[PDB]
Amino acid sequence: MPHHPHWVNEHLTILQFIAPSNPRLRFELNPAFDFFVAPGDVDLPGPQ
Amino acid sequence: AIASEALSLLSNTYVDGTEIDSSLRIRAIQQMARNLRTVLDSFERGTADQLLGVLLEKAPPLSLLSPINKFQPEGHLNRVARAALLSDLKRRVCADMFFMTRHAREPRLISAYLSDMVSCTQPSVMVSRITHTNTRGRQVDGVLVTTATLKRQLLQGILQIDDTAADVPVTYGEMVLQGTNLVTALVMGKAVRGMDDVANARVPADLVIVGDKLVFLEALERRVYQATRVAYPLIGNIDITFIMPMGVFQANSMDRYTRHAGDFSTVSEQDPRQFPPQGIFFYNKDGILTQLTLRDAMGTICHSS
Amino acid sequence: AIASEALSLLSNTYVDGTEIDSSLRIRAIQQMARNLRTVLDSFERGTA
Amino acid sequence: FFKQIRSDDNSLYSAQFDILLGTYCNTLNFVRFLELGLSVACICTKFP
Amino acid sequence: TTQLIQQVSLTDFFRPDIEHAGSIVLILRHPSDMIGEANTLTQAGRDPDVLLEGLRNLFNACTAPWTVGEGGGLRAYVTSLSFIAACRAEEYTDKQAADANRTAIVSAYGCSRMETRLIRFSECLRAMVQCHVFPHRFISFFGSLLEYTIQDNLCNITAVAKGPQEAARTDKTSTRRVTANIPACVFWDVDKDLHLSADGLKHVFLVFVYTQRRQREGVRLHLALSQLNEQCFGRGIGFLLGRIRAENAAWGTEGTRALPLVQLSNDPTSPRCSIGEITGVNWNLARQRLYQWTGDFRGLPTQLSCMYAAYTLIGTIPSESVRYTRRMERFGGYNVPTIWLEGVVWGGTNTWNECYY
Amino acid sequence: IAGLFNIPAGIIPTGNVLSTIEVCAHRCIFD
Amino acid sequence: PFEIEVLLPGELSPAETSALQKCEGKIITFSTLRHRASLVDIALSSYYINGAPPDTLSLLEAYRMRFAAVITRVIPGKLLAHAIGVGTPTPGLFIQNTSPVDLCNGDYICLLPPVFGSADSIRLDSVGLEIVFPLTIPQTLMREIIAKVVARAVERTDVICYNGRRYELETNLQHRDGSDAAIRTLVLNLMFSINEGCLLLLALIPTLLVQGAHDGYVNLLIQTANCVRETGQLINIPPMPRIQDGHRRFPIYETISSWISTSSRLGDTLGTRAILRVCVFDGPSTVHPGDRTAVIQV
Amino acid sequence: PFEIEVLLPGELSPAETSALQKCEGKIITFSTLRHRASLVDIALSSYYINGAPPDTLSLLEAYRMRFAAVITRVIPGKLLAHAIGVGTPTPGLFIQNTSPVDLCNGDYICLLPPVFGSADSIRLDSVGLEIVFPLTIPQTLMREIIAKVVARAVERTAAGAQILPHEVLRGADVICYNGRRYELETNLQHRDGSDAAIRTLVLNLMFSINEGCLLLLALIPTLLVRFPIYETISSWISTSSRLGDTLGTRAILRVCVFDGPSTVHPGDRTAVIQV
Amino acid sequence: TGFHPGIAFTVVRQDRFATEQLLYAERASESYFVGQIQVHHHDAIGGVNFTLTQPRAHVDLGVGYTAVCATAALRCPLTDMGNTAQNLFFSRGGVPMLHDNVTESLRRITASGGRLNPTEPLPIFGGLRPATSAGIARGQASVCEFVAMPVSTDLQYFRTACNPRGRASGMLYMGDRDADIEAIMFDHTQSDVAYTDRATLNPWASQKHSYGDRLYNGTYNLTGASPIYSPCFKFFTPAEVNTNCNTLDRLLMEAKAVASQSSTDTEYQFKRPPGSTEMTQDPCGLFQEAYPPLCSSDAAMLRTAHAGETGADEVHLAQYLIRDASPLRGCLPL
Amino acid sequence: VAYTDRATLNPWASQKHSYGDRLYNGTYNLTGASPIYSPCFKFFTPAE
Amino acid sequence: EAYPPLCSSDAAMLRTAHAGETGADEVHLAQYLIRDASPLRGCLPL
Structure with missing residues (x-):
C-alpha cells in the first residue's frame, strides 16, 4: 500500500467534494459508471 | 516629435528644384505646423488641470467643516x-455621506445643503481693478465645479440660472525687476516688489x-479631458471598513429566548437552533447570499506564529 | 583654466535674454579678460 | 502572362474599376484658460 | 575624440628617447604588494621568500636603491613591451628575431649595467611564477606613446587612452601621425593557425602563458590578433596549448574512501539521525558512527595551480581585410623586424580572463 | 528659517484682507 | 556609429516586402562582420552544421560565435542594420519584444533560440530561404530555462512559472554531438570547485541544521537543497586534519574565492551572456509583447 | 548632455546645508532617470525592501538594477547632477575618493556597499531622511575584498559551532596596496556588522558551495580511490548562476589624471573619464 | 470535521467605491506665477524629440479655508464583497516547527479549500506570488482578516460603529500632555475611554504584546514579505503624531484625501505598488471605527415571506441578525 | 468565475466528457437526425 | 444565462386565500416556491 485509497474517504461534504482540491473529482462523469485506475494489460482474475 | 526623412528634406538648403520633392517638403512643413499648433495649446489646456487639482488637497470635507x-x-x-462636538461630528459623518443619491427624491434638502456649503468658507483679499461680473454689474463670488450629470440634476429644478453671459478680464499682469531692484539682488541677495x-x-x-x-458653475468634460488619455478628476474613491462577528454565543438564560410561540417549528425532536452557530451570512456586491464559516479561518490560526 | 559654468554661459547661442543672466554673462567674459591679460604678459616676463 | 483568345471571346469588354467617393477630417478647435469660468478662482501673473 | 594620460617615472625600464613613437607601454604595481600577496598565497611546502631574494637584487642593480618602501611617487612606473620581449627572448619561437631585439635593446641602452638588470628581471618573473603570484595582475596597459620630454634619468611621457590611432598630432615629428609598432617576436595571430577566413573586424589580446615545473618556469608575452569572439578566444587558445595544459595538470602540485550517499538514501533501513537528537543535548552518542568515510582530500590540483594563460581585450580594427606590414628598420644603431598596425581603436576595460583547464 | 525679512516691515500694503476672525485658533497652516 | 547594409534580393513579391517592413526593430546575427553582406548569411540555411537544420544546443553555440546586429528602418531596396558587440556609440537604440513575457525598466536582455511554440518567422518562397529571429528574455528567466534544458539533457543520455503564469518548453535534442559537449563543460566547473577547504564547510552541516530551526528563514534554504539535507543525518564527517603551514596561510580563503570566479563563468559558458539593458525615457514602466522600447548598450 | 536636477527642500537648517556643500563629487544612484526628481529617491528609504532596511546582498542587487549618477555642484536652493548612463558626454567629470585605499592612474573604478567600517553619510533630521553614499574601490582589489570579508564571518561561526576553537593562526588580516596596509578589524569584540548586513550573504554562500563539492562526490564516486537526482541539478545550476551574476565585477569609470598628482588619498578629488 | 472549539472570531473587511465629488472655491483663492518656456533639443528613436518646459508657482492667500469639497453621489462599486480569507503562509521569519513534514502537511491542508495560495515549487529568493487565474467575474476580490476573541462576548457592542481592537484609541482624546496617546492604547490600569466601566472588550488583542498585537503591529514586521493587503493594519499601528496646534485643527488637517493603499489592476487587492500616485478619501480611518453591515448568523431569518422588504428580527432562539448601520443603506440592491 | 469558492455546481454536466456534455455539444453530432429543436444547445457549444 | 419563472414544487403554497395576489412564501416544510425574476413580470395574466 504505497498511498491511501481514494474510495475510503466518504466523510466529505458536498462542498469539499465539489471544491477543486478534490483529487477524485475528475473521475465523476457519469452517474451510472465508476471511473477508476487499474494496472493495464492484465486479466482478472490473475496471479496471486 | 520630428522624423528623420522630414529633417533631411528640410536641411537641404537649396540643393533641389525638381517637381516631386516640392510636394514632400510642403507636406513636411504642414505636418510640423499641425503638430506645433496643438503642442502650444497643450499648455493652455494643462493650466486648468494644474488648477482644479491643486485645490483638492486644500479643500477639506464639508461634513467636517460645517x-x-x-x-x-x-x-x-x-x-x-470638545467631546460633545466630536460626538456630533461622528454622527454627521455617518449620515451625510451621499446627498444626491439618498435624498434624490426630495429636492429641498439639496438646496439647503448647497446653501450651507456656500456659507461655510471664508473670503480672501479683495484688491483688484477689474474682475468677473455679470451683464448688470454684480460681481461673482465663487465657483462650483462638478460632473455634467450633477450639473444637469442641479439645473433641472434645484438651482435657478441668473445669467448666461459674463464679462471676464483678458490680461495677465506681468511683473519684472528693474532699477534699484536688480542692484540689490546681486550684492545683498534680496528684493521687494x-x-x-x-x-x-x-x-x-x-x-x-x-x-x-452669484457663483460660476462649471462641468468641464468636453472642452478639457475630451479625447485625451488622462482621467477626469472628481471621480475619486472612498474606502470603508466592515466588521462582523462569526461564532459568538450569548452565555445567558434570559437572552436565549424567542419572541413568539411557534416561531420556527420543526418536525425534529431537537430544535437545531439552540446549538452555538459557526458561520455568518450576508449579501454580496450584487445581492447574492454568501457564507463565512469557521473553516475559512484556518489560514491565520493554524500558523507557526 | 576656465570654469564649467562660465563655459556653458557662453555656449548658449542666444537661448537667453532675460535680465539677471545678462550680468552673469558680463562677469564671465571679464574673468577671461583678466586672466588672459596675465598669461600673455607671463610669457613676456618669462623671457628674462 | 500568355493570354491566347481563339477569336473574339469574352473578358474583352468588361470595364471594372474602383472609385473613391471623397474624404473627411475634423476641426480640433482650441481653448484658452481665461475664457474658462475657473479663472475667477485665482489671480494669475507672469514672472520671467 | 581621443584622450591622453601623463605620468612621470624613472627611466631604468623605459627610454622614450630610443623607443619609436607608437609602441606599447605598460605600467607596474608597487612591488611591496608582491610580498604581502606571496606570503599568503604561496603553495604549502614551498619557500615563500625566494621571491624576496629575487626582488631585492633587482633594485640593488638599479639606480636610487634607497628609495623603496615609501612609494612617494618617484619609482619605475612604466615599462616598454620590447623590454619584456627581450627579457624573455630565449623562449619565443622566432630565434633570430628574439636575439636581434635582445642585443638591440642592450646596445641602445646604457649597455654597462643593462645585462645584469635583464637577468635580474628574468629570474624575478621566474620567482613571480613560483608562489602563485602570476604577473597578469601587476602589469597594466597604457596606450601608444605620443609625446615625451626628458632631461636626465627622469621623463614625462603622454600616451593615448582610447580611440583612433591617427586622430592625434605628435606635432614634432615629420608627419603629425603615428601607427602602432610591435616587435615581430610577440606577434602571433591564431586564425591562421585555426584555418579560418581572415576578413572583417578583429580583436587584439595579450596572453601570459605559464609553465609550472620543479625549478623550471617560463612566462612569455604574446600580442594575439584574432577575429574570434570575446569569450570564445578561451576555447580557441586551449586547442593550441593543449600540451602545456596537460603538463601543468601533472607537474603543478608537488608539495580516502568514497561514500554511497544516493545508494543508502534510495534504500531504507539505514541508521537514521532524526532532528530530535541534533537539537543539541547529547550530540555525540547520537552521531557515534552513523558512518565513518575516513575521508580527506588535501593534495589535489586546484584551478589556480593548473592555469596556463590569461588574456584581456585591448582594441579592435574596424577596417576589414587588414594589411599589417612587417619590415626591418633601424632601432638606435641596430635593425630589428617590426610589424606596423594601422587604424586600431583602443578601448576596453582591463579585465583578465584566466584559462585554467 | 524665516525671519530674514522684518516681520512688521511697514510699507505700502498690497491689498486688504477680509474675514476678521480668531486666527490663533488655527495656526498650523501658517509657517 | 557602425552600420551594416543588407542588400535585399531583387524581384521580390510585394507581399514579402510588406512582411519585411514589419520587422523594424528585431535582431539578426552575422558570422563575419562587414559593411556589405548578402541575405544568405541571415538565413537559417547558414546555421546548418553538417547538412541539416541546427539544434537548440547547436544554436546556443552559434549565438556566441556569431556577431549581433539590430534591424533599423528598411527601405524597398536596402535593409539597414547596426552592430552591437563591438564598442560603437549608437544614439536612440530600440528593440521589439519577441518573447511572450513582459519586460520592465532595468532588465538585462539575453538571447536564446525559440524554445516555445513554432517560431514566428518570415518565409521567402521565391528566394527559397527563411529567416528566424532570436528570442529575448530577461536574465532571471534565462538562468531557469538553461537549468532545466541541461537537466533534461543528462536525462536523455517542464513547467516555468513567471508572474503567476506557467509555460512549457519543447526542447529539441535530435543531435548528439552537442549534447555531450555540455556535460564536459559542466563537470569541469564542479571539479575545479574542490579545494582543501571543503572539509571545514562540510563539517558545519550540523550547526546549520541547528540554525535551521528557530530561524524561520534557513528552512527555505534547507527545503530547496537536497544533498545537505540528506547528508546532514547520514554521514559522520571525521573531525579535522591540520594545516601544513598554518602560521602564515589562510586555507578557507582560496575556496571562498576560487568559487567566486567559477560561478561567474558558469552562467556564461553554459548559455549566453547579457547583451543589453532596457531603460526607456518618457515611456511606460512595463512593455507588452510586440511593443518597442529604448535600450542601452551594455 | 543629460543632467538630473535634485530639488533642494525648503526650510533646511544651515548646518545641514553646509554639510551638503561638502559632498560635491559623490555618487548618487537613481531608480528611474528623469530631469526632475525628489529626495525620496536619493534617501535610504527608497532602498529598503520588505519594510526592513536593505541588506548587503540586497544592496548588491540594488546597484545593478539601479542607475548611477554623479553630483557636480550644489546651490543654496538647488542641486544638480549628471548621469554615467547611456551616452552623456559629461565634461570635467570629477569624483571624490570615499574608500580608505588610495588610487593611482589607469585604475578602473567599481562600486561596493560599505563593509569595512561604519558608513559615513549626511543625516537630515529636519526632513527625517539620510543619504548613504557608495564606496569606490579599484577593480583588482574588489574580488579580494569580498572573499576576505565572508571568510572572516565563517571563522566566527566555526569558533562558536566547534566545541573548541582552532585559534592557532597567522595574526591579523590586512590588505596591502601601493605599499600601504589597511589592517582591518583588529579586535574580536565589536561585532558591528558581523551578522548585521552580511548575515544572509554568508548563508547563501555557505549552501551553494556545500552543494558544490558534495554533488560531485555523490555523482562520481571514483574520484577518491525516492531520490530525484535531476531536480537537484537544475536547482544547483539556477542558484549558482544567479549568485554569480550578483557577485559580478563591472568597471564604471577610469581614473585618467592629466597634469596632476598620480597617487591620490582618501578625501581628494580627481578627473575621471567615462569608460 | 465541524467541531466548534472555545473561541469566536471577528472578521474585518475593507472595500472601496468610486464616487462623484463637488468642489467649491472662493474668488481670490490663490496667486499663480508663470515663467517662460524653454526648448530642449534631444535625439530620438528615429528622428528628434523636442521638449517644452515651463515653471510655475502657487500660493494660497487664505487667512483661513477658501475651498470645500463634498462627495455628493455614488457610482458603481469597484471591489467585491466576497469571502476570501487571508493566507498567513506568505511570510517568513517566525519560529517554525521542529518536524518539516508537519509544516508541509499544514500548508497543504491550508491551501486545500481556498482560493489564493503560494505556488507549490515555493521559489527561494522571490516574492511568493499567487498563481494568476483566468478572467474576472464582477470586480476585484477583497481579503478578510480574522481576529480571535472569547466566546461569550457582548453582542450589543457589534450593533453600532465599533472598533476592531477591542478598546477605543486615537489622538482625539487629549488636552494636557503628549505622553497620552501611548497611555490610552495599552494601559489597562484605567478604564476604557468610550465604555468607562471596563478595560477592554477582548483581552487577547488589546494589550502591549497580546496575540493579535504581535500578529500585526507595523513595528514588529511579521508580514513584510506578504504581497497581499491587510486592512486591520491601520487599527493596530500606533500612528505617531506631534503637537503643534489644537485637536480641532489637527483633525481638520488630517482629512486631506491621503494616498491609496491598494491596487486597481489586480484581482486580489495586493499591496500599494511603489510609484503609483492616486489619491482616495479615507473616512473612518481617522476615527478608528468600522460600520457593521447587514449580517445574520442564520439565513432563514434574513428574508420575510412577503415578497418585498427583508426581515429585521434581532434574536430568534440563539442566532442573531445585526441590522445594517453603514452609510450605504439606500444602495446595493438586494 | 462567478462563484469563486467551488469548481462547478453539478459535476455531471460540466466536464470535458461528462454525461450532459456528451449528450449534446454540437461537435459530437449525437442528434443530427433529430428534426426537433433543442434549447440547451447554445449553452454547451464552445462558440468560437 | 436563463431566467427562472414563477414555479413551486407544491400547488397549495402557490395562491393565498384572499381573492387577489398570489402567495410568495419560500419554503413551507420541505417544498419550495421560487419567486419570479424574469423580465416578463407585469404580463402573462394569472
Whole structure:
C-alpha cells in the first residue's frame, strides 16, 4: 500500500467534494459508471 | 516629435528644384505646423488641470467643516465641549455621506445643503481693478465645479440660472525687476516688489444664485479631458471598513429566548437552533447570499506564529 | 583654466535674454579678460 | 502572362474599376484658460 | 575624440628617447604588494621568500636603491613591451628575431649595467611564477606613446587612452601621425593557425602563458590578433596549448574512501539521525558512527595551480581585410623586424580572463 | 528659517484682507 | 556609429516586402562582420552544421560565435542594420519584444533560440530561404530555462512559472554531438570547485541544521537543497586534519574565492551572456509583447 | 548632455546645508532617470525592501538594477547632477575618493556597499531622511575584498559551532596596496556588522558551495580511490548562476589624471573619464 | 470535521467605491506665477524629440479655508464583497516547527479549500506570488482578516460603529500632555475611554504584546514579505503624531484625501505598488471605527415571506441578525 | 468565475466528457437526425 | 444565462386565500416556491 485509497474517504461534504482540491473529482462523469485506475494489460482474475 | 526623412528634406538648403520633392517638403512643413499648433495649446489646456487639482488637497470635507464653523464661541474649547462636538461630528459623518443619491427624491434638502456649503468658507483679499461680473454689474463670488450629470440634476429644478453671459478680464499682469531692484539682488541677495514707497469680453457662461451669492458653475468634460488619455478628476474613491462577528454565543438564560410561540417549528425532536452557530451570512456586491464559516479561518490560526 | 559654468554661459547661442543672466554673462567674459591679460604678459616676463 | 483568345471571346469588354467617393477630417478647435469660468478662482501673473 | 594620460617615472625600464613613437607601454604595481600577496598565497611546502631574494637584487642593480618602501611617487612606473620581449627572448619561437631585439635593446641602452638588470628581471618573473603570484595582475596597459620630454634619468611621457590611432598630432615629428609598432617576436595571430577566413573586424589580446615545473618556469608575452569572439578566444587558445595544459595538470602540485550517499538514501533501513537528537543535548552518542568515510582530500590540483594563460581585450580594427606590414628598420644603431598596425581603436576595460583547464 | 525679512516691515500694503476672525485658533497652516 | 547594409534580393513579391517592413526593430546575427553582406548569411540555411537544420544546443553555440546586429528602418531596396558587440556609440537604440513575457525598466536582455511554440518567422518562397529571429528574455528567466534544458539533457543520455503564469518548453535534442559537449563543460566547473577547504564547510552541516530551526528563514534554504539535507543525518564527517603551514596561510580563503570566479563563468559558458539593458525615457514602466522600447548598450 | 536636477527642500537648517556643500563629487544612484526628481529617491528609504532596511546582498542587487549618477555642484536652493548612463558626454567629470585605499592612474573604478567600517553619510533630521553614499574601490582589489570579508564571518561561526576553537593562526588580516596596509578589524569584540548586513550573504554562500563539492562526490564516486537526482541539478545550476551574476565585477569609470598628482588619498578629488 | 472549539472570531473587511465629488472655491483663492518656456533639443528613436518646459508657482492667500469639497453621489462599486480569507503562509521569519513534514502537511491542508495560495515549487529568493487565474467575474476580490476573541462576548457592542481592537484609541482624546496617546492604547490600569466601566472588550488583542498585537503591529514586521493587503493594519499601528496646534485643527488637517493603499489592476487587492500616485478619501480611518453591515448568523431569518422588504428580527432562539448601520443603506440592491 | 469558492455546481454536466456534455455539444453530432429543436444547445457549444 | 419563472414544487403554497395576489412564501416544510425574476413580470395574466 504505497498511498491511501481514494474510495475510503466518504466523510466529505458536498462542498469539499465539489471544491477543486478534490483529487477524485475528475473521475465523476457519469452517474451510472465508476471511473477508476487499474494496472493495464492484465486479466482478472490473475496471479496471486 | 520630428522624423528623420522630414529633417533631411528640410536641411537641404537649396540643393533641389525638381517637381516631386516640392510636394514632400510642403507636406513636411504642414505636418510640423499641425503638430506645433496643438503642442502650444497643450499648455493652455494643462493650466486648468494644474488648477482644479491643486485645490483638492486644500479643500477639506464639508461634513467636517460645517459644524466646526457653526460652533465658534472662542475658537479654543475645553474637554467637555470638545467631546460633545466630536460626538456630533461622528454622527454627521455617518449620515451625510451621499446627498444626491439618498435624498434624490426630495429636492429641498439639496438646496439647503448647497446653501450651507456656500456659507461655510471664508473670503480672501479683495484688491483688484477689474474682475468677473455679470451683464448688470454684480460681481461673482465663487465657483462650483462638478460632473455634467450633477450639473444637469442641479439645473433641472434645484438651482435657478441668473445669467448666461459674463464679462471676464483678458490680461495677465506681468511683473519684472528693474532699477534699484536688480542692484540689490546681486550684492545683498534680496528684493521687494514695487520699490516706490516714500514713507473685458462678453463670454457665454452659466451663472446661478445659491444662498445670496452669484457663483460660476462649471462641468468641464468636453472642452478639457475630451479625447485625451488622462482621467477626469472628481471621480475619486472612498474606502470603508466592515466588521462582523462569526461564532459568538450569548452565555445567558434570559437572552436565549424567542419572541413568539411557534416561531420556527420543526418536525425534529431537537430544535437545531439552540446549538452555538459557526458561520455568518450576508449579501454580496450584487445581492447574492454568501457564507463565512469557521473553516475559512484556518489560514491565520493554524500558523507557526 | 576656465570654469564649467562660465563655459556653458557662453555656449548658449542666444537661448537667453532675460535680465539677471545678462550680468552673469558680463562677469564671465571679464574673468577671461583678466586672466588672459596675465598669461600673455607671463610669457613676456618669462623671457628674462 | 500568355493570354491566347481563339477569336473574339469574352473578358474583352468588361470595364471594372474602383472609385473613391471623397474624404473627411475634423476641426480640433482650441481653448484658452481665461475664457474658462475657473479663472475667477485665482489671480494669475507672469514672472520671467 | 581621443584622450591622453601623463605620468612621470624613472627611466631604468623605459627610454622614450630610443623607443619609436607608437609602441606599447605598460605600467607596474608597487612591488611591496608582491610580498604581502606571496606570503599568503604561496603553495604549502614551498619557500615563500625566494621571491624576496629575487626582488631585492633587482633594485640593488638599479639606480636610487634607497628609495623603496615609501612609494612617494618617484619609482619605475612604466615599462616598454620590447623590454619584456627581450627579457624573455630565449623562449619565443622566432630565434633570430628574439636575439636581434635582445642585443638591440642592450646596445641602445646604457649597455654597462643593462645585462645584469635583464637577468635580474628574468629570474624575478621566474620567482613571480613560483608562489602563485602570476604577473597578469601587476602589469597594466597604457596606450601608444605620443609625446615625451626628458632631461636626465627622469621623463614625462603622454600616451593615448582610447580611440583612433591617427586622430592625434605628435606635432614634432615629420608627419603629425603615428601607427602602432610591435616587435615581430610577440606577434602571433591564431586564425591562421585555426584555418579560418581572415576578413572583417578583429580583436587584439595579450596572453601570459605559464609553465609550472620543479625549478623550471617560463612566462612569455604574446600580442594575439584574432577575429574570434570575446569569450570564445578561451576555447580557441586551449586547442593550441593543449600540451602545456596537460603538463601543468601533472607537474603543478608537488608539495580516502568514497561514500554511497544516493545508494543508502534510495534504500531504507539505514541508521537514521532524526532532528530530535541534533537539537543539541547529547550530540555525540547520537552521531557515534552513523558512518565513518575516513575521508580527506588535501593534495589535489586546484584551478589556480593548473592555469596556463590569461588574456584581456585591448582594441579592435574596424577596417576589414587588414594589411599589417612587417619590415626591418633601424632601432638606435641596430635593425630589428617590426610589424606596423594601422587604424586600431583602443578601448576596453582591463579585465583578465584566466584559462585554467 | 524665516525671519530674514522684518516681520512688521511697514510699507505700502498690497491689498486688504477680509474675514476678521480668531486666527490663533488655527495656526498650523501658517509657517 | 557602425552600420551594416543588407542588400535585399531583387524581384521580390510585394507581399514579402510588406512582411519585411514589419520587422523594424528585431535582431539578426552575422558570422563575419562587414559593411556589405548578402541575405544568405541571415538565413537559417547558414546555421546548418553538417547538412541539416541546427539544434537548440547547436544554436546556443552559434549565438556566441556569431556577431549581433539590430534591424533599423528598411527601405524597398536596402535593409539597414547596426552592430552591437563591438564598442560603437549608437544614439536612440530600440528593440521589439519577441518573447511572450513582459519586460520592465532595468532588465538585462539575453538571447536564446525559440524554445516555445513554432517560431514566428518570415518565409521567402521565391528566394527559397527563411529567416528566424532570436528570442529575448530577461536574465532571471534565462538562468531557469538553461537549468532545466541541461537537466533534461543528462536525462536523455517542464513547467516555468513567471508572474503567476506557467509555460512549457519543447526542447529539441535530435543531435548528439552537442549534447555531450555540455556535460564536459559542466563537470569541469564542479571539479575545479574542490579545494582543501571543503572539509571545514562540510563539517558545519550540523550547526546549520541547528540554525535551521528557530530561524524561520534557513528552512527555505534547507527545503530547496537536497544533498545537505540528506547528508546532514547520514554521514559522520571525521573531525579535522591540520594545516601544513598554518602560521602564515589562510586555507578557507582560496575556496571562498576560487568559487567566486567559477560561478561567474558558469552562467556564461553554459548559455549566453547579457547583451543589453532596457531603460526607456518618457515611456511606460512595463512593455507588452510586440511593443518597442529604448535600450542601452551594455 | 543629460543632467538630473535634485530639488533642494525648503526650510533646511544651515548646518545641514553646509554639510551638503561638502559632498560635491559623490555618487548618487537613481531608480528611474528623469530631469526632475525628489529626495525620496536619493534617501535610504527608497532602498529598503520588505519594510526592513536593505541588506548587503540586497544592496548588491540594488546597484545593478539601479542607475548611477554623479553630483557636480550644489546651490543654496538647488542641486544638480549628471548621469554615467547611456551616452552623456559629461565634461570635467570629477569624483571624490570615499574608500580608505588610495588610487593611482589607469585604475578602473567599481562600486561596493560599505563593509569595512561604519558608513559615513549626511543625516537630515529636519526632513527625517539620510543619504548613504557608495564606496569606490579599484577593480583588482574588489574580488579580494569580498572573499576576505565572508571568510572572516565563517571563522566566527566555526569558533562558536566547534566545541573548541582552532585559534592557532597567522595574526591579523590586512590588505596591502601601493605599499600601504589597511589592517582591518583588529579586535574580536565589536561585532558591528558581523551578522548585521552580511548575515544572509554568508548563508547563501555557505549552501551553494556545500552543494558544490558534495554533488560531485555523490555523482562520481571514483574520484577518491525516492531520490530525484535531476531536480537537484537544475536547482544547483539556477542558484549558482544567479549568485554569480550578483557577485559580478563591472568597471564604471577610469581614473585618467592629466597634469596632476598620480597617487591620490582618501578625501581628494580627481578627473575621471567615462569608460 | 465541524467541531466548534472555545473561541469566536471577528472578521474585518475593507472595500472601496468610486464616487462623484463637488468642489467649491472662493474668488481670490490663490496667486499663480508663470515663467517662460524653454526648448530642449534631444535625439530620438528615429528622428528628434523636442521638449517644452515651463515653471510655475502657487500660493494660497487664505487667512483661513477658501475651498470645500463634498462627495455628493455614488457610482458603481469597484471591489467585491466576497469571502476570501487571508493566507498567513506568505511570510517568513517566525519560529517554525521542529518536524518539516508537519509544516508541509499544514500548508497543504491550508491551501486545500481556498482560493489564493503560494505556488507549490515555493521559489527561494522571490516574492511568493499567487498563481494568476483566468478572467474576472464582477470586480476585484477583497481579503478578510480574522481576529480571535472569547466566546461569550457582548453582542450589543457589534450593533453600532465599533472598533476592531477591542478598546477605543486615537489622538482625539487629549488636552494636557503628549505622553497620552501611548497611555490610552495599552494601559489597562484605567478604564476604557468610550465604555468607562471596563478595560477592554477582548483581552487577547488589546494589550502591549497580546496575540493579535504581535500578529500585526507595523513595528514588529511579521508580514513584510506578504504581497497581499491587510486592512486591520491601520487599527493596530500606533500612528505617531506631534503637537503643534489644537485637536480641532489637527483633525481638520488630517482629512486631506491621503494616498491609496491598494491596487486597481489586480484581482486580489495586493499591496500599494511603489510609484503609483492616486489619491482616495479615507473616512473612518481617522476615527478608528468600522460600520457593521447587514449580517445574520442564520439565513432563514434574513428574508420575510412577503415578497418585498427583508426581515429585521434581532434574536430568534440563539442566532442573531445585526441590522445594517453603514452609510450605504439606500444602495446595493438586494 | 462567478462563484469563486467551488469548481462547478453539478459535476455531471460540466466536464470535458461528462454525461450532459456528451449528450449534446454540437461537435459530437449525437442528434443530427433529430428534426426537433433543442434549447440547451447554445449553452454547451464552445462558440468560437 | 436563463431566467427562472414563477414555479413551486407544491400547488397549495402557490395562491393565498384572499381573492387577489398570489402567495410568495419560500419554503413551507420541505417544498419550495421560487419567486419570479424574469423580465416578463407585469404580463402573462394569472
